[PDB]
């Protein structure tokens, strides 16, 4: 009616900013005092993977910790054997402008998408001996930016038209939709048991969704600019986000607010990706000045650098058993560190 | 060798994937790639016919040279997230309508787009080809519709020669890296097939200055 934007809606945001302050009695970086540091952490390039001809944009590990897939702007999708650095499959894509890839947990399927607005599914196990397309999922209106399997039949996608969506692979229809954001959604990450997931958008916020219902549960607001990457903590009760203002942050789901900020005065470039190591004591982030820093997560001291690359570090990932770390870059190489 | 019989036949499979990868990266380096931009009102659609959801490609061979043109205006997202995918095209083509000067908010809408792409940090080394379409409809509109409705400072003749010539310097002054980039202006006819003959001549100029700068001989 009259003035209704004023009184009621801007009041409930003043009830939330005062309830988060009624539970923040102490800060993380005080109680994490008088514990041992982790000391310097040098690692070394164990493998190097050659064969792409253009920039590499995405990568994802298989669940056995030995195979992996990668995508690049030359229209190829390669599956690698990382112990003996052999190529297992090479897949040609219809279009060349690809921005994400994922591996099915069973190991039977892989997914792909980009500036064509489609998510393509590929069957790896056939009676004929080659890899053929199995499904195409249409309906988004902007470029696809991320996707993740839940099992052999379900998959979630985030899109540049400000929306996320849940799909059914038997048919080709999206069964649920997710709307609240007001900018382009850039990334998403699934809970360890796959009941919840989070996403971050260019409106500088992150959201917690429920999968079976389809409703937002919490919103988080700390950054000054866009959010590029996001990841869950192994416990399942915190997550970290990396933004375009050269900072990372830690959020707590049950305290409902922020715990730490990971920054430094000599670092003034954006962040492309982020990941946690097993047990969650280290936070790896890969930045836009060609490096990859390693942070102590409880304390806020940076505890290492790994500087083998020659151009922008676009993606990284840590394996399930915790053995190695991979990075892809805009010079077309992949490297395994340990 | 310490490898098994099956370990050796997996190495041989891999070296034959390696050979089809090289065969594909050589057959794709024989084509020039071009991004097509411009605040889209009229001209951009006819120049494709002149040469014959997400992203739109097109092919055409002319005189032993193969091209791929990319139209991108059908996206409607934040342009500052995906535009860096096009780092490393050979050139950019840019379309403008000369018949949008006194309709002057629109002519200054094009000068707003030409200023942001020409000064990106991703396109520091990329030259620009520039078009100016609809040179018929601009013939008489200078007569009935005088200028200074599009540019207040222009205090000179409405003779249609200083007019088109004055619109030109207003764009090329927008180039702020006079050393690492050139502009190539041309006035599109729409009946002659000289349109594709100009794109050929400018593109073979862009490549020789790249080679001569790769060996240090510049």
């Amino acid at each position, epitope marked *: 009616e009259l003035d209704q934007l004023r009184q009621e809606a801007e009041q409930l945001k003043n009830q939330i900013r005062d309830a988060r302050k009624a539970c923040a009695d102490a800060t993380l970086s005080q109680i994490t005092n008088n514990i041992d540091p982790v000391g310097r952490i040098q690692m070394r390039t164990r493998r190097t993977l050659r064969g792409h001809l253009a920039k590499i944009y995405a990568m994802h590990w298989g669940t056995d910790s030995r*195979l992996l897939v990668s995508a690049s702007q030359d229209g190829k999708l390669i599956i690698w054997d990382s112990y003996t650095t052999n190529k297992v499959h090479a897949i040609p894509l219809r279009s060349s402008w690809v921005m994400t890839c994922a591996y099915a947990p069973s190991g039977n399927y892989v997914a792909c998408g980009g500036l064509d607005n489609i998510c393509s599914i590929y069957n790896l196990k056939t009676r004929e*001996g*080659n890899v053929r397309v199995s499904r195409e999922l249409a309906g988004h209106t902007g470029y696809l930016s991320c996707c993740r399997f839940l099992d052999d039949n379900q998959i979630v996608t985030s899109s540049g038209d400000t929306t996320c969506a849940l799909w059914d692979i038997e048919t080709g229809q999206q069964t649920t939709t997710f709307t609240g954001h007001t900018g382009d959604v850039m990334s998403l990450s699934l809970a360890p048991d796959t009941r919840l997931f989070v996403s971050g958008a260019c409106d500088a916020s992150a959201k917690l969704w429920d999968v079976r219902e389809g409703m937002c549960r919490q919103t988080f607001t700390g950054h000054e600019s866009d959010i590029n990457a996001i990841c869950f903590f192994p416990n399942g009760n915190a997550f970290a986000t990396g933004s375009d203002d050269a900072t990372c942050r830690l959020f707590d789901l049950r305290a409902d607010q922020e715990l730490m900020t990971y920054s430094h005065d000599n670092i003034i470039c954006g962040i492309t990706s982020v990941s946690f190591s097993k047990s969650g004591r280290l936070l790896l982030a890969g930045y836009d000045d060609f490096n990859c820093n390693v942070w102590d997560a409880l304390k806020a001291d940076r505890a290492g650098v790994l500087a083998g690359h020659d151009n922008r570090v676009s993606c990284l990932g840590v394996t399930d058993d915790g053995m190695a770390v991979a990075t892809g870059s805009w010079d077309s190489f992949l490297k395994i560190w340990n | 060798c*310490t490898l*098994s*019989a*099956e370990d050796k*036949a997996a190495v041989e499979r891999s070296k034959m994937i390696d050979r089809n990868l090289r065969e594909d990266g050589e057959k794709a380096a024989r084509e020039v790639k071009l991004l097509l931009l411009g605040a889209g009102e009229s001209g951009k659609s006819t120049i494709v016919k002149q040469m014959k959801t997400g992203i739109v490609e097109t092919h055409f061979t002319f005189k032993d040279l193969h091209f791929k043109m990319f139209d991108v205006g059908g996206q409607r997202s934040e342009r500052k997230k995906w535009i860096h995918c096009f780092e490393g095209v050979t050139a950019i083509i840019f379309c403008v309508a000369l018949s949008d000067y006194d309709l002057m908010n629109r002519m200054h809408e094009s000068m707003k787009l030409f200023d942001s792409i020409c000064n990106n940090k991703w396109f520091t080394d990329t030259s620009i080809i520039l078009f100016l379409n609809k040179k018929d409809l601009f013939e008489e509109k200078i007569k009935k519709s005088p200028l200074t409705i599009c540019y207040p400072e222009y205090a000179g003749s409405n003779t249609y020669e200083e007019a088109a010539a004055y619109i030109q310097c207003q764009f090329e002054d927008l180039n702020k890296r006079k050393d690492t980039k050139e502009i190539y202006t041309h006035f599109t006819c729409a009946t002659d097939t000289k349109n594709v003959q100009f794109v050929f001549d400018a593109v073979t100029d862009v490549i020789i200055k790249n080679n001569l700068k790769d060996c240090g001989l510049f």
Partner: single-chain antibody
Amino acid sequence: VQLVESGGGLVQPGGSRKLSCSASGFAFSSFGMHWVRQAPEKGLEWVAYISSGSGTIYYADTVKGRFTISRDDPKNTLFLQMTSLRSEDTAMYYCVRSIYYYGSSPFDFWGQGTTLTVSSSDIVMTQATSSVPVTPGESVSISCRSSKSLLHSNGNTYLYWFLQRPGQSPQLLIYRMSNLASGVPDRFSGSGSGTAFTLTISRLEAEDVGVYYCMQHLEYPLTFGAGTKLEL
């Protein structure tokens, strides 16, 4: 998927024939190929191998300078030229397809066979049973023994199990070891270590009747074991 071979017939000692096989239903150029032979009333014997891309070829010492194997990809066909045939070459000849990468299953599809009747350092595999009678629903075991250990330093042991029913071609049951081929009931299983292996069937149906073979794939030449029949 099917493989159909032709040629064969009757030949005098010293003549020559030419065999072929027609592939249909799969990506022929991606698979390596084998020829395997079986004389009247005895077991299986490996003959020759040509890899995908024609870059590698191996032969068995019995037929080394007398036979030649080749392939024609755009036609999808496989050849075997024979010269100076002797009476030890009477047999039925099969055609087998196999692909090699991390996690694949070699030796999975076998042809129907063609007969040729001519007129008138190696690992040894020993399986010492024959004609063991059993009733349905019972538990039966089989074993063969190697003269060298098949466990390689990378972790794998290379032992396979095939099955041949009266009137048909062999089928695969277990690859490298304890791995079950697709389309096979779960009541089979394979176990062992080093130089002693075993194949177990839990409770039989009326179609698990025939002879059973074992094979090493640790190094060329490839060698089979003799057969272990099962009569009900």
